Amino acid sequence: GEEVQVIIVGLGIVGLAAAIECREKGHSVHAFEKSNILKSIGDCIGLQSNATRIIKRWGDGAVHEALRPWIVSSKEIRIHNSSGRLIIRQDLSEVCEQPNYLLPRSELIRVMYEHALKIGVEISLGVEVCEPSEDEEGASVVALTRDGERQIVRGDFIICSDGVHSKMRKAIMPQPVEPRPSGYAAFRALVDTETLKGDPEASWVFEGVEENDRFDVFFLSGAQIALQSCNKGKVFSWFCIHQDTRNLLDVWTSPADPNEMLDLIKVWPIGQRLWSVIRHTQPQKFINYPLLNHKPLDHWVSSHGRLILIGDAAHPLSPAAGQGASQGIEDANVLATSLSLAGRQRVSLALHVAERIRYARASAVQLISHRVNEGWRNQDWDAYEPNEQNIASLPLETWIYGHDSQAYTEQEFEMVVRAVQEGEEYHATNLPDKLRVQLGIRNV
Ligand SMILES: Cc1cc2nc3c(=O)[nH]c(=O)nc-3n(C[C@H](O)[C@H](O)[C@H](O)COP(=O)(O)OP(=O)(O)OC[C@H]3O[C@@H](n4cnc5c(N)ncnc54)[C@H](O)[C@@H]3O)c2cc1C
Numbered sequence: 001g002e003e004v005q006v007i008i009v010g011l012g013i014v015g016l017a018a019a020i021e022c023r024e025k026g027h028s029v030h031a032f033e034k035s036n037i038l039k040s041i042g043d044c045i046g047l048q049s050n051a052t053r054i055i056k057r058w059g060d061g062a063v064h065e066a067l068r069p070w071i072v073s074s075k076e077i078r079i080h081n082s083s084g085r086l087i088i089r090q091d092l093s094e095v096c097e098q099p100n101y102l103l104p105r106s107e108l109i110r111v112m113y114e115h116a117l118k119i120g121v122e123i124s125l126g127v128e129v130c131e132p133s134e135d136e137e138g139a140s141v142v143a144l145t146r147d148g149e150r151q152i153v154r155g156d157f158i159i160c161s162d163g164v165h166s167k168m169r170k171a172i173m174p175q176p177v178e179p180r181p182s183g184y185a186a187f188r189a190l191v192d193t194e195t196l197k198g199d200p201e202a203s204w205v206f207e208g209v210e211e212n213d214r215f216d217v218f219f220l221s222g223a224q225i226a227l228q229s230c231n232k233g234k235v236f237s238w239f240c241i242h243q244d245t246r247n248l249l250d251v252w253t254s255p256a257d258p259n260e261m262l263d264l265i266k267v268w269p270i271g272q273r274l275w276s277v278i279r280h281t282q283p284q285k286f287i288n289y290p291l292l293n294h295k296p297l298d299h300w301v302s303s304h305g306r307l308i309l310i311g312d313a314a315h316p317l318s319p320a321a322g323q324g325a326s327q328g329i330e331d332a333n334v335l336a337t338s339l340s341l342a343g344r345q346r347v348s349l350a351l352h353v354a355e356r357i358r359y360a361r362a363s364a365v366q367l368i369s370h371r372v373n374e375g376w377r378n379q380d381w382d383a384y385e386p387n388e389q390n391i392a393s394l395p396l397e398t399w400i401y402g403h404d405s406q407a408y409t410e411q412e413f414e415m416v417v418r419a420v421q422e423g424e425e426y427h428a429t430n431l432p433d434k435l436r437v438q439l440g441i442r443n444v
């Protein structure tokens with residue numbers, strides 16, 4: 001009559017989603033995180049309908065109501081050239097049939113953190129998790145606190161949601177493959193709303209944002225720039241994908257030079273108008289984040305089936321594509337659903353079923369996102385005008401954003417169990433069949 005004891009390593013977006021999913025489905029959760037995750041860092045996170053579908057269930061709608069101010073109200077993407085001329089209005093009516101969110105990462109973390117505490121997730125901040133182990137009966141980790149004290153923590157299995165620099169990953173894949181640089185990076189930041197207000201030369205950016213979030217894209221030679229608003233103009237954010245061969249580290253903390261962005265855009269006719277807004281980014285908030293191409297791992301689940309990698313620990317995606325967080329939320333939902341269907345006496349089965357459901361779909365999104373990183377969409381803008389051909393269409397694919405991962409898992413669970421127990425390949429239908437073979441995805 002004892003609950004499953006879930007251990008979670010890392011409380012980024014995916015670890016918090018895994019904690020909420022597991023706890024709402026009746027399992028005990030003790031989550032560990034090394035940092036103060038409430039600190040204001042990073043810029044905005046987008047969540048598409050495949051993620052909001054999952055989030056809508058949490059607390060019988062409580063989290064969705066907390067996130068309602070952040071529901072995307074853009075009806076179109078406005079695509080501009082280097083003169084600022086509007087070339088194409090790309091309709092978002094289908095993409096936005098169901099809710100999407102756009103909000104500062106720190107606000108999404110806060111909302112998820114508060115709900116996790118409310119529903120009884122046990123959270124331990126200031127803990128670096130080390131040295132996982134497992135056998136046929138259980139798993140354990142070492143909780144290392146900042147005073148150097150070590151505490152053993154035991155559970156039924158370990159959820160490794162510790163991000164792109166996951167140290168848990170080597171417990172599954174001890175020989176790490178190296179991501180290769182795409183040759184591109186992304187400048188990105190929030191704008192300081194206060195100083196943005198009160199700049200008369202930036203007043204244009206507020207037009208209509210109380211009714212429809214701004215979603216402007218600009219294509220210049222060497223730059224793909226987006227300017228967005230959310231929550232009725234309370235927040236403005238921007239990014240700029242650009243060529244960069246420097247040896248940049250993929251972290252969200254390093255100093256970046258705002259003058260590099262000014263130099264890139266000031267030589268084109270629209271540059272001064274864009275800078276009228278972007279100049280109000282706080283200097284220490286400029287991030288220049290490299291767009292690295294990570295190869296799918298061979299698998300996500302450990303030898304005894306009591307550790308699983310999810311989120312960016314399993315399938316890091318660049319922030320340039322828009323499915324990174326949403327796919328990690330699908331990991332959390334499928335894993336928790338699979339655990340609930342398998343039960344405490346079949347934990348390894350649960351993790352292996354979740355891996356079989358998630359792997360090909362997550363890997364397809366990952367491999368397609370490599371093309372956005374390498375700039376395949378770009379053309380010579382002296383000759384071509386940008387249009388829908390140049391917009392990475394991953395956030396526009398119905399097969400991604402229309403998907404209901406929980407319903408899929410419930411309907412397919414016993415078929416996946418049979419594939420796992422009979423040693424047969426499971427052919428998931430949560431991605432297009434042509435895609436899996438076209439991309440060279442190898443089933444686990
Ligand atoms: C500080 C920060 C800012 C970010 N800002 C943005 C942004 O503006 N836009 C965007 O699109 N993406 C951003 N990201 C990335 C984004 O969170 C992910 O791409 C994705 O949405 C969710 O990935 P995740 O939860 O799997 O991993 P992450 O979000 O990277 O979270 C991993 C967590 O695990 C913790 N952790 C790592 N190792 C250990 C350990 N041994 N023990 C305990 N805890 C550990 C880390 O402290 C971190 O909180 C940011 C990530 C970080 C870490």
Ligand SMILES: CC1(C)c2[nH]c3cc(Cl)ccc3c2C[C@@]23CN4CCC[C@]4(C[C@@H]12)C(=O)N3
Nearest residue numbers: 095100217224226320321322390391392395
């Ligand atoms: C910002 C992204 C993640 C995005 N976020 C969305 C949200 C909704 Cl709700 C609908 C569509 C999108 C898109 C499509 C975008 C628009 N950007 C223009 C330059 C680079 C990029 C990235 C990508 C692109 O090529 N396609």
